[PDB]
């Protein structure tokens, strides 16, 4: 714990980045979090929405 000041920086950044990646899976109201699963199922006028 003596070096906690440096470890804390690493932990904060690793966590911020891991949060940014996991967040990628959110739907945000979309039918799917994966673009390929939208494009393969819907035509442009609906896929774009």
């Amino acid at each position: 714990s003596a070096l906690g000041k440096l470890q804390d920086v690493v932990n904060q950044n690793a966590q911020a980045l891991n949060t940014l990646v996991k967040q990628l899976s959110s739907n945000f109201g979309a039918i799917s979090s994966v673009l390929n699963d939208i494009l393969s199922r819907l035509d442009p006028p609906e896929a774009e929405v």
Partner: protein, 50 residues
């Protein structure tokens, strides 16, 4: 079957060509909600029930 006692037919282990339905002139209603009627031929399903 009657609407109160509708039939449940399982479709499995087969090739589903949906263009034979979509491009026909025999249907008055062809309403697909989670998928486009013309994307069906590019998809696989665990089961399809009619």
């Amino acid at each position: 079957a009657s609407v109160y006692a509708w039939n449940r037919k399982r479709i499995s282990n087969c090739v589903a060509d949906y263009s034979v339905l979509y491009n026909s002139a025999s249907f008055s209603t062809f309403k697909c909600y989670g998928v486009s009627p013309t994307k069906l031929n590019d998809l696989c399903f665990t089961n399809v029930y009619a």
